A paper describes a structure:
The MlaFEDB complex is an ATP-binding cassette transporter to actively translocate the phospholipids between the inner membrane and the periplasmic protein MlaC4,5. The MlaFEDB-mediated glycerophospholipid (PL) transport was reported to play an important role in maintaining the integrity of the lipid membrane. Consistent with the previous reported low-resolution A. baumannii MlaFEDB map8 and our E. coli MlaFEDB map9 (EMD-30355), the MlaF (cytoplasmic nucleotide-binding domain, NBD), MlaE (transmembrane domain), MlaD (periplasmic phospholipid-binding domain), and MlaB (cytoplasmic auxiliary domain) subunits are assembled in a stoichiometry of 2:2:6:2. In summary, we characterize four structures of the A. baumannii MlaFEDB complex in nucleotide-free and vanadate-trapped conformations using single-particle cryo-EM.
To understand the mechanism of glycerophospholipid translocation coupled with the conformational change, distinct conformations of MlaFEDB were trapped using sodium ortho-vanadate. Vanadate acts as a potent inhibitor of ATPase by forming an ADP–vanadate complex that mimics the intermediate state formed during hydrolysis. Three individual conformations were classified and refined to 4.0, 3.6, and 4.0 Å, and were named Vtrans1, Vtrans2, and Vclose, respectively. All three structures display bound nucleotides at the ATP-binding sites. However, the maps are of insufficient quality to distinguish between ADP, ATP, and ADP–vanadate. Comparison of Vtrans1 and Vtrans2 to nucleotide-free structure shows the conformational rearrangement of the MlaD. MlaD hexametric ring rotates clockwise at different levels, whereas MlaFEB remains unchanged. The three vanadate-trapped structures of MlaFEDB reveal different levels of conformational rearrangement of MlaD and MlaE coupled with nucleotide binding and glycerophospholipid translocation.
Author numbering:
A (entry chain J): 3 to 111
B (entry chain K): 3 to 193
C (entry chain J), D (entry chain I): 168 to 193
E (entry chain L), F (entry chain G): 3 to 56
G (entry chain E): 92 to 182
H (entry chain D), I (entry chain A): 1 to 256
The structure:
Amino acid sequence: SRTSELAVGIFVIIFGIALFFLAMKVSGLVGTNLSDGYTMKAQFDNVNGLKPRAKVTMSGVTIGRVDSITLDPVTRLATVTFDLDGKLTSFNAEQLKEVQKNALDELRY
Amino acid sequence: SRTSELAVGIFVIIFGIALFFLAMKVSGLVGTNLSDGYTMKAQFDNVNGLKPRAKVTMSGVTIGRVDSITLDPVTRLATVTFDLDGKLTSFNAEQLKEVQKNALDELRYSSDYTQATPAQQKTMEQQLISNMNSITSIDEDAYIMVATNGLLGEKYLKIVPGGGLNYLKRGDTISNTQGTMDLEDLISKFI
Amino acid sequence: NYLKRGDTISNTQGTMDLEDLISKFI
Amino acid sequence: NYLKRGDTISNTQGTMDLEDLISKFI
Amino acid sequence: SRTSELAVGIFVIIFGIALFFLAMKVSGLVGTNLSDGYTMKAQFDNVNGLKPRA
Amino acid sequence: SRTSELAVGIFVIIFGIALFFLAMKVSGLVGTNLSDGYTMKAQFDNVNGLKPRA
Amino acid sequence: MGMLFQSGALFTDMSVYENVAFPIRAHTKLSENLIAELVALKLESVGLRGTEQLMPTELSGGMNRRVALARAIALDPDLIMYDEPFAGQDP
Amino acid sequence: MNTIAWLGRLVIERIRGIGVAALMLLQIIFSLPSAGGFGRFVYQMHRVGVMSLLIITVSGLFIGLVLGLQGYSILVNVGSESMLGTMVSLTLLRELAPVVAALLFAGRAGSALTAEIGSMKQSEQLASMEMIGVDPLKQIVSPRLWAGIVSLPMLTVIFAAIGIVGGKLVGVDFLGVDEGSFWSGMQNNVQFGHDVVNGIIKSIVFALLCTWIAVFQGYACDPTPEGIATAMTRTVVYSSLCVLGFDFVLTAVMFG
Amino acid sequence: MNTIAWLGRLVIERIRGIGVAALMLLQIIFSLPSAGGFGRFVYQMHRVGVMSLLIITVSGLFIGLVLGLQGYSILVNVGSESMLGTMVSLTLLRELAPVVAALLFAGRAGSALTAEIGSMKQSEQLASMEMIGVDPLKQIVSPRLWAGIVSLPMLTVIFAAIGIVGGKLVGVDFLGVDEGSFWSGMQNNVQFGHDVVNGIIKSIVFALLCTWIAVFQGYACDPTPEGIATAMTRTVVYSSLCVLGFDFVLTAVMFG
């Protein structure tokens, strides 16, 4: 009745603990999330041992991942599609004037 | 009733052996799983340790496997037999139409058409019998070399395209190659 | 100038390793 | 001139990996 | 029905010990020699850490 | 009866193999145990990362 | 038709109240004040009525077949088969 | 040539013996759900799951400590023990949590399931239930199957988590490395959708073969209670040949 | 506070429950040898040893192949796979032949021993033998003990040998390394008196705890054949907590 049903409940708790411990203490699910991650493309020549789902950097710090990579067999060159953050990778509502002030001043100087 | 149990009971074991060959070849131990395969061959002077079943890349993307190593004792040059897959090499119909317009542009140029005789209308005509089949994305001078995969790891055949104006067949011999480089050969020049 | 959501970079640089490095010296 | 909690060290040095060192030498 | 019963025991122990020979073929305790493989020998000065049968 | 002494013999004979396979195909017992050995001793200043049986 | 299993076939996880009520609930839906009512009668018709609380365990083997008799007269069949009622028990 | 016929007639029986057991499996899952089966099922998961929880927790440690002992003794002369957090994790995630937690599950709940159904055939509760028409495949077997498919992947996760924590205990608290380094390398190598979710897909298709072979040998055993005890040791052989044999293939695949 | 008393009186019983079992063990080995016991013993080793030989041979391969698969997949990016012949051997010699061959032996002959004695108490052959005065400890138990102490170290050796040969098969015949560097990288690193003889001392003191706990639960079980089947799954829990627990206490001694 209630004697064993509730002692099933601590078993789901202990499994519930050690799934969180696998998901969000070891597995890279804490570091997979972007926000309006837009996509680019670039044309390489050497991608030796460069797997997909990597972690891209920009200036000493990570920004995001690499989505998928194929060859374009018309010009023999690598094609790399990759997720690019639209937040920390771009700007935000403060910085829009902060680049409007500098794209204007460095053009009309 | 028991003979239907020798009907089903054989079938599960037949389903178990026949699945295991599907789970073998996809991982890949025997029976390469790349589609539409066709074998090419090449010759090296030095393959300083290169196991069968190694990988071939075009600019990084895996495009085939190595079959075996043959040596010829009267000429002492190595010979590597390897297989490719054309789904990402060997142009399709639309990419077939970018090379005939290029052979009419680059090969049949204002100065390049009349390099032998100024009536080279057969130059696109002879090439088209080698273009619906027997056509590689690899150039007529694209040389193959042996790479190193980082700084420590298994060697792999890396193809360098670029340059040239004609193409090979499905099964030719790569006329320009390059052998490996050994650690003693590094310290020889450096010291 | 900068890039739109979806474009290409006009300057790339492929990876290098031991098979390229020693020839990259001289 | 010592520091308090939450202060800023105005002298920092970034990282230089192996690929910067090779191009530095040869 | 000896068409069925002993024929299973015929097939299995044929298939069983033939698999056991595959063990001794890869064991390094049975044979796997060469053929018409001549022998030379050389005289060196330094062999640093060379183990036999390399 | 004789059916028991047989199939317990075949268990020992397989065990006779896999002890010999460990003795003189894996662990060094066939490489060691030289013949007539004396003592030559020397003194160093630094022997870190040096073990017996070297 | 309901039968008797030589050694008595009790489910040693359900209660003795749950043994005899089981063929009713396996057959028909009734309200609980009737389903708990028919068991208190058929348990008296065998003479073991002060139960419905203890398990099939701690029932003496003599009392064991009598509950299995009550499950054999669950609803009210008209064809009960006995596989050796006299197992070799006491006289 | 007569003992040849005895061997021949034995493995002919084992093939048919399988073809019955597949028909019993398709007759269970392709059925409408019984009324109030959930209350039967949760009590069943209290029997198979929650009872086995202790013997896999304290066996989760001793696999972890020996991995935290030989994993240290190997890695010290090579010096590069930034792999201690990675060579505890990648073995425990990829093989020993699918493999060793199966051979301990076939031990306790793999073999206590074939006894409980082996006892129910002999006293003919299962025969008496059929005459009332409750068809005991849906009554006794089917909650004892679905409490085995669900409850094994809920155990290897608890096995792998307490294994990794166990490797950290004798590693950095009794021998000593840089805990930081540990966690770092640990989370900087182990993907989630490639390794953990592949570490559970192996632990589902182990839970099917370890329970369906277990619940079959209880149902299609015989009476005469030397007929129970010959069957409770017929699963534990037949499970462990099919745990490890089905591991290989799967591993090779999900690890070309 | 009553379920506290139920837990308290349960583990009080388990302690006493041990102190009986030690007294039964000292009463066996400190006895004069029975007349013609050797003919009883060799037939017993037929039952426990030779029967279990198949399930450890083909389980010797599948441990070897996965060691020959992950042992290759790890060692390729580091490149230095002169350790493939050493990282197949040193794990299989030190740990997995003492550990995994115990959990497979507790499975088959560890649990079929407690049934055969569990059946003999219930039909009262053991009671009838006492009235003739043949004292069944020396008649039934003692050949069923000495066929378990001798027959387990004769199995881990067969486990470790077919394991190493299995690692060589998928290593150099399907993936490919130097067949010279395998054994020459092996034979040099693996001492005999330090590794193999220490790999058998662990497999003796596993054979004692895995059989004496097994032959006890058959003798001191109860009748009522739900009393056999509760005991055949009381060893396989109690063995595997004491195989792995006594492993880790041992490997810290010889490989500190």
